[PDB]
Each structure stands twice: as structure tokens, then as C-alpha cells.
């Protein structure tokens, strides 16, 4: 089960100048491409090794498409500004995300196409890929106009086609990064904060993909009420980190177990302190 995803972000800058446009492309948890309008290159750039031996034609096409989207969203910021009747002194944000999910057989699962203005949902293609979901009165203006240009059928063909074609091509080219699963390297730490209580911390480093599950148990009974968990976070090398800590009364340290679930493990881990 793999996914490809594109994230674009347009931000108006009145008082500083023309808007800024940023777009990144991800296959699963790995970025492989970027475009910054403020950057000097004015080209779509690679961010993964396995995307570089696409041709000059590819990079030409992709540059054209992302610069086009860029210009389009610059105009959409203006149209929104009069939709919502807002001043031109304000700095506003128009985000767009789209992409597709393919199954284990290499075939279509989900399609995504989504807009947001200033952090709130605007209009979003529904899973059935035949209709839109307008989130307010202005988005309904957009919904009706698009429903009269059969835009959703145009996006279907991309999502069910082009996107899955690219994603699968990519998956094969980055087969040795995208399709391998690094298991977490796990260790446990002991941290006395008293002579009665002590902090026990379960680590998970160097894993990929990012979906992980760290749990603490006391005598088989979960301890989610006394557990401190941190968000999964990028290590910076393409792998992710996470830890879960619990405070234990001195002497009861062995009754505690740390429980790890990842794709790259044959079966779960149970960790005990010694």
C-alpha cells in the first residue's frame, strides 16, 4: 500500500511584493521533488536520488506544470479576496494538496484533490471522484462553476491514471528506498528523579516508514494514563524517531514493558529493563 502526494502553498505578500509559491512532492514519507518561486533556479528540482535520471523533457514538463499552477493560484488568491470581500493589505494563504493511493497489487485505491484558504477547508473532491464538497457559500460558487465544466471528470482521469502511472514508475526506480522497511533500533533508559520514583524511557530510532506504535504496559494492562508520548519526528537522514516515557515507583521497574509495532519487524517487540 503506497501513496503519492503533492503539497502546494501560495502566500500573498502585500507590502513585501508578489506572492510566494512552494510545492513539494512526496512518495510515502520521502520527499522527491520541490519548486520554490522565490528561489533563483525557477526550475522544478529533485530532492531524491532516484528521480534524477528522468529526462530533460520530464524536468521541462514538470517545470511548466508547476509554474502554471503557480500563476493560476496567484489569480485564485485575487478571486478569493473578492469572494470574501477582504482588504488587499492582508496576507492570505491558499493551499492545495492532491495525489493517489495505490494498493499492494499496484492498482488504484484512493484519489485526493483538495483546497484550503487561510487554514479552513474551501472545496474538496469527494472519494467517489464525481462530485465536490463546498465548505461555504463562496466554495459553492466555485463548486457550481466547476460542475458546469466537468472539471471533476478531468481530475478523475489524472488521479486514476497519470498519478498511479508515475507513482508506480517511481516506486520501481526507488525500489531500494521506497520499498524497503528499516526496523526501529530500540533501547531503554533509566532516570531516577527521586529515591521512590524513576523515569523509564523507551526509544525507537532510525526507522522507516514513519508509522510506529510505542506502548507501555504494567502487568499486561496498558498504561496510557501515565505515559508521555512525543510526536514522531524526522531524524534528518530519511529515518524517523519516537520515544515513550513512564514514571515508575522504585522496585516495580520490571513489571513494566515497552511495546513496539513497525512494518519492518517480523513481529512486535517487548522490552524489559535490566
Amino acid at each position: 500500500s503506497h501513496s503519492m502526494r503533492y503539497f502546494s502553498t501560495s502566500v500573498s505578500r502585500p507590502g513585501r511584493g508578489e506572492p510566494r509559491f512552494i510545492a513539494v512532492g512526496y512518495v510515502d514519507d520521502t520527499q522527491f521533488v520541490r519548486f520554490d518561486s522565490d528561489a533563483a533556479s525557477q526550475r522544478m528540482e529533485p530532492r531524491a536520488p532516484w528521480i534524477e535520471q528522468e529526462g530533460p523533457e520530464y524536468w521541462d514538463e514538470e517545470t511548466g506544470k508547476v509554474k502554471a499552477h503557480s500563476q493560476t493560484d496567484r489569480e485564485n488568491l485575487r478571486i478569493a479576496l473578492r469572494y470574501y470581500n477582504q482588504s488587499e493589505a492582508g496576507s492570505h494563504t491558499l493551499q492545495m494538496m492532491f495525489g493517489c493511493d495505490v494498493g499492494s497489487d499496484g492498482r488504484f485505491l484512493r484519489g485526493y484533490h483538495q483546497y484550503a484558504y487561510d487554514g479552513k477547508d474551501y472545496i474538496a473532491l469527494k472519494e467517489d471522484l464525481r462530485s465536490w464538497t463546498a465548505a461555504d457559500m463562496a466554495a459553492q460558487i466555485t463548486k457550481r462553476k466547476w460542475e458546469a465544466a466537468h472539471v471533476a471528470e478531468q481530475q478523475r482521469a489524472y488521479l486514476e491514471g497519470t498519478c498511479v502511472d508515475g507513482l508506480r514508475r517511481y516506486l520501481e526506480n526507488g525500489k531500494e528506498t521506497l520499498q524497503r522497511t528499516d526496523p526501529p533500533k530500540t533501547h531503554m533508559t533509566h532516570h531516577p528523579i527521586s529515591d521512590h520514583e524513576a523515569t523509564l524511557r523507551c526509544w525507537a530510532l532510525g526507522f522507516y516508514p514513519a508509522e510506529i506504535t510505542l506502548t507501555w504496559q504494567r502487568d499486561g494492562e496498558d498504561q496510557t494514563q501515565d505515559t508521555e508520548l512525543v510526536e514522531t519526528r524526522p531524524a534528518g537522514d530519511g529515518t524517523f524517531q519516537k520515544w515513550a516515557a513512564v514514571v515508575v515507583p522504585s522496585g516495580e521497574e520490571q513489571r513494566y514493558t515497552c511495546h513496539v509495532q513497525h512494518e519492518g519487524l517480523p513481529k512486535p517487540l517487548t522490552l524489559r529493563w535490566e
Binding site: 512532492g25 506544470k65 502554471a68 499552477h69 493560476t72 489569480e75 469572494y83 465544466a149 502511472d165
Partner: peptide, 9 residues
């Protein structure tokens, strides 16, 4: 690969 979406809102 990227989308060819030119639609105004």
C-alpha cells in the same frame, strides 16, 4: 508527475 490544473476558482 504533476497535475495540469489551470482552473480558476
Amino acid at each position: 508527475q504533476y497535475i495540469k490544473w489551470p482552473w480558476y476558482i
